[PDB]
Design a binder for these strands. Structure first.
Length: 66
DNA sequence: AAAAACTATGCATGCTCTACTGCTTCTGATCTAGTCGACC
């Protein structure tokens, strides 16, 4: 689950453990936020999303199971 | 002319540096096996 507050990101796992370090808290650092920041709209300052994280291989252009 | 005093020297001891070689032990780098956390 990802919480976006302006320029602040907070990633939490299924059990509530803080994963923001791995995925990043700000666009300047991380593995997902620096690249997915541009995908958000201008009129979205507060947002909460719940989803799944996978490993996308671009050579096959497909997701790889755990 | 004859006896005594001073100097040359020289060989041996112990110390000191200086190095060389061997053994013992401490430190560091690397490899392998086991363990913990998160998830599903």
């Amino acid at each position: 689950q990802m919480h976006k507050d302006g320029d602040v990101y907070k990633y939490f796992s299924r059990n509530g453990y803080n994963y923001t370090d791995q995925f990043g808290a700000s666009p300047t650092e991380g593995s997902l936020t620096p690249f997915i920041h541009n995908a958000f709209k201008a009129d979205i300052q507060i947002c909460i999303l719940d989803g799944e994280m996978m490993a996308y291989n671009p050579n096959t252009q497909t997701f790889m199971q755990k």
